Design a protein around this motif. Structure first.
Motif, mmCIF file in Angstrom:
data_model
loop_
_atom_site.group_PDB
_atom_site.id
_atom_site.type_symbol
_atom_site.label_atom_id
_atom_site.label_comp_id
_atom_site.label_asym_id
_atom_site.label_seq_id
_atom_site.Cartn_x
_atom_site.Cartn_y
_atom_site.Cartn_z
ATOM 1 N N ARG A 1 -0.915 -42.856 19.893
ATOM 2 C CA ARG A 1 0.122 -42.897 20.900
ATOM 3 C C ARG A 1 1.310 -42.012 20.523
ATOM 4 O O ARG A 1 1.492 -41.551 19.364
ATOM 5 N N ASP A 2 2.114 -41.786 21.551
ATOM 6 C CA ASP A 2 3.366 -41.039 21.493
ATOM 7 C C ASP A 2 4.490 -41.984 21.032
ATOM 8 O O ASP A 2 4.782 -42.944 21.728
ATOM 9 N N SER B 1 8.508 -43.067 20.195
ATOM 10 C CA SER B 1 9.941 -42.786 20.323
ATOM 11 C C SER B 1 10.701 -43.719 19.365
ATOM 12 O O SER B 1 10.235 -44.823 19.068
ATOM 13 N N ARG C 1 3.969 -41.782 13.854
ATOM 14 C CA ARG C 1 2.923 -41.038 14.566
ATOM 15 C C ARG C 1 1.645 -40.898 13.722
ATOM 16 O O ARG C 1 0.593 -40.831 14.293
#
Lengths: 344, 347
Positions: free
Chosen positions: B228-229, B231, B223
């Motif tokens: 962006r996000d 995962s 991150r």
């Protein structure tokens, strides 16, 4: 009186076939006899020099692999898993049971075959993975078996019930660790014990491994969706065993995915679903024809995880060959094939 | 800058603690007497000699291990803490604020208190400069620091494999990591699961499906290079070696390989501890063992639209004690590579 030849008797797969043939109940009561044992080099040697564990057979002479010498038997195992036996196989009675450990008859698409193998497509035979939907019916009374790759076996068993139930997306990722017997018995530097012991390495990555299209094929048989497969094999310092970590995006609850696995596997003698909070380990399946599978959902990552352990040389190779042979011949499927691992 | 350091090591009888000691013994400041190895502590087995725990460290074999207490640890310019989580939080309060504290534990790694509480079930202690000098901006936080949070071993591998592709915006921010690890990475506390006879000849995934505590650390480091996000599907796999992490890391891409390669060359071309493999070569943990290097290869699987990055490190060197000593050098103003080989002890 079933007489069996083993071609490629001196590799790891042919020696494992031989191990399982010696403990089979049909060998015990004389229904099964072991006939010609063949290899390409070192015709004239005794089997004892290639396989010192197989002491009951240590005195057998390894014959050269020729169509005529393999002729005159009721079942012929061709254990060239990195070989190309399409030639031998076209010169044998369509009533001889042929169990090919090689890839020659695995793939159903000729364009794919040519691309990955750079030769002419020989065709396709019944895939010797009885646990796949509809595979077991193809295998009953068949005289032709293409045994699956070791890696396709582990990945297909990890993934197919989720994908069949449409509970995950058809873009899958597989990273599978394997012992070194899966690379075969070729004297390469990269396979020397001093090189492999203590060390791990991915090889044939990003799509070049020829098992990639095999996994795609198996999954495309349980879905109408376009299937994509990221497959990464990793060699680890063990002689045997594959641990496959298989993942795909999902929005389905764990309880629904778990039921799809109970459903597919509840009556499968060789599939063990781990109890709640247990995970597979390859040491538990070594020397057995079993697959140990655990499933999970990574909620934060929206990711389904299936883990499958197999012995690459039993369920991934010779135990699958023998399982499918049982089927082809009308014998109990589990004959000669234990579910109990030799651990530790 | 620093013209001398008296160094203490707390948790000296563990794997990380013993590897810190090995590296300190071979460090040039130790050879010319600018670095003195002071107090060696472990809560457990206090009173034994170091030789009873670490027979390889013969030059220190006679040293008596003391109790891990702030009074034993005080009076040092630098203190390494290789302790279970929560311990360094307490110890950091008790030691002089001017001591260089290099924390091999997890206490000061995470920058989100809610994420910490979630995975550790305790109060967030805070966050210190993350001791991975190669990440963007990290070297500027470590030069002259008095506080270092050493990365976990698996995030080290996964971060070095994946950050360049993500920082350049060439991969999607949803990543999968399957990393095989030697058993020293599981620590030196004797449990049945970690017995020779169970581990030898066997491989097993553990702490799967997002429960492994290193998972938020990978997400955090990723991150930090994107808006962006992110995962992370992270699966750790124990294997029958004592050292080494081989991280296989994938994300979807539509970028040509030549563009991905260029981003890695740009990231690592002048990084002494990163060796980006020549095209067609792949990493092996055997090649990095005993060194502070990471070997990385990247490729694109066109049919799967997947970027694949492979990273190999020694979990105990670049993944732990090497990272600590490398960050200690930065903190002290000594050449970053002092005491730290790029040459693996192979075979």
């Amino acid at each position: 009186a079933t007489k069996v030849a083993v071609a490629g008797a001196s590799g790891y797969a042919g020696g494992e076939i031989l191990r399982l043939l010696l403990g089979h109940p049909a060998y015990a009561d004389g229904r099964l006899r072991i006939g010609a044992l063949t290899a390409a080099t070192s015709a004239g040697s005794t089997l004892g020099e290639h396989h010192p564990h197989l002491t009951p057979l240590a005195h057998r002479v390894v014959e050269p692999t020729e169509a005529a010498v393999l002729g005159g038997h009721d079942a012929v195992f061709l254990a060239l898993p990195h070989g190309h036996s399409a030639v031998l196989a076209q010169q044998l009675s369509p009533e001889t049971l042929i169990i090919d450990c090689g890839a020659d008859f695995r793939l159903t698409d000729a364009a794919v075959w040519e691309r990955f193998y750079g030769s002419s497509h020989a065709g396709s035979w019944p895939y010797g993975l009885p646990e796949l939907p509809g595979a077991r019916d193809q295998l009953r009374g068949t005289r032709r078996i293409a045994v699956p790759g070791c890696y396709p076996t582990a990945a297909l068993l990890a993934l197919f019930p989720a994908l069949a139930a449409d509970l995950i997306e058809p873009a899958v990722t597989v990273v599978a660790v394997s012992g070194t017997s899966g690379a075969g018995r070729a004297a390469t530097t990269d396979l020397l014990g001093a090189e492999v012991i203590g060390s791990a390495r991915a090889y044939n990555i990003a799509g070049v491994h020829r098992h990639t299209p095999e996994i795609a094929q198996g999954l495309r048989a349980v879905t109408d969706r376009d299937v994509s497969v990221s497959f990464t094999p990793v060699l680890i310092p063990a002689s045997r065993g594959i641990l496959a970590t298989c993942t795909a995006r999902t929005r389905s609850p764990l309880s629904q995915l778990r039921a799809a696995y109970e459903k597919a596997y509840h009556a499968e003698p060789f599939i063990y679903l781990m109890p709640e909070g247990q995970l597979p380990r390859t040491g538990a399946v070594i020397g057995s024809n079993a697959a140990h599978i655990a499933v999970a959902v990574d909620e934060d990552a929206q990711t389904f995880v299936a883990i499958a352990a197999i012995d690459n040389l039993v369920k991934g190779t010779a135990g699958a060959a023998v399982q499918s042979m049982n089927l082809a011949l009308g014998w109990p499927e589990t004959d000669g094939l234990s579910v109990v691992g030799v651990a530790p």
